[PDB]
């Protein structure tokens, strides 16, 4: 599935992401844009051997298990395949475990480099929330 911006914003809100640990809603929409381009089935094999899965690109060496990555920790305790659904529940639940404090969105390099310091609220203005 490929989400439109307002459609994803509404779903993320219903799933409790607005102000989660002090982070405004637009941060999460901006991150999804640069990580998977709103595509719920996106994947990316990193040179280091791990692969990133889904709308929020969850990693296979630390967070989910793909049974093919050396040193897998699987901290979210979930198979990487289970994160490719059209329903964002699983991906949101793992994202909440990753961000344990007010500085946790640093977990996504694309957010740190391309979202932090910009008007992230611009991604949600005009969306009927």
């Amino acid at each position, epitope marked *: 599935k490929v989400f439109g911006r307002c459609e994803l914003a509404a779903a993320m809100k219903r799933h409790g992401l607005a*102000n989660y640990r002090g982070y405004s809603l637009g941060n999460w929409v901006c991150a999804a844009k640069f990580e998977s381009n709103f595509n719920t089935q996106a994947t990316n094999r990193n040179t280091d051997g791990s692969t990133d899965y889904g709308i929020l690109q969850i990693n296979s060496r630390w967070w989910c298990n793909d049974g093919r990555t050396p040193g897998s920790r699987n901290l979210c305790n979930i198979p990487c395949s289970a994160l490719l659904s059209s329903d964002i529940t699983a991906s949101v639940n793992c994202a909440k475990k990753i961000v344990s404090d007010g500085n946790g969105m640093n977990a996504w390099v694309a957010w740190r480099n391309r979202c932090k310091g910009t008007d*992230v609220q611009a991604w949600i203005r005009g969306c009927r929330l």
Partner: antibody
Amino acid sequence: QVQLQESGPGLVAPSQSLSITCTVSGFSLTGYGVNWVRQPPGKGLEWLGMIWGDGNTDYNSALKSRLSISKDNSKSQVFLKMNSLHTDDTARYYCARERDYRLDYWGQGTTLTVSS
Amino acid sequence: DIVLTQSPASLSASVGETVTITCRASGNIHNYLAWYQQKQGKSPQLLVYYTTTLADGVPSRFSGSGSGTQYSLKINSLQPEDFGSYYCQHFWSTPRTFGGGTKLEIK
């Protein structure tokens, strides 16, 4: 430790322009915005404008034609320039860091008086 | 532009009393409202953000509420260090504006 400090000319003639510098430390200007706010003696706060981490700018509607904000990321400095001074411009000027829609750290301010 | 109407202009109260300040906007600001406290001769300090979140180190006696166009700040059993001025500020798009301020004074 996040710190912000303003530097200005104190007294300026209505024939010249206003230029104030905000020197910061403890964080990178590329990841946070910086807002400018003023307060006339004995009065309330007035929003002047801002520069986002990415360099984009936004200004107070009534004052936009005579204000200009810029910055130097490598030197950790933000600049405010204002022209066409009036005695109504007499006030304490502050720079403040913005973090995800709240002004979390403020400078001590610098006073400015418009001469005749 | 969206303007903020803050009331009342001043309050006279005693330690131990509870007080409330209101801030109403001319247009919907979608919960993007913050509150600041300013002591005599000092710079403003952040108290609350996104309507209800208390800033670090801020005492639990302070509480914020609101939605759409109407908001409020409440201080339960006020203490000596709470006297001073208070200001609301919105962050819905640009330009941003501040309310006119409220002066909390000893009765």
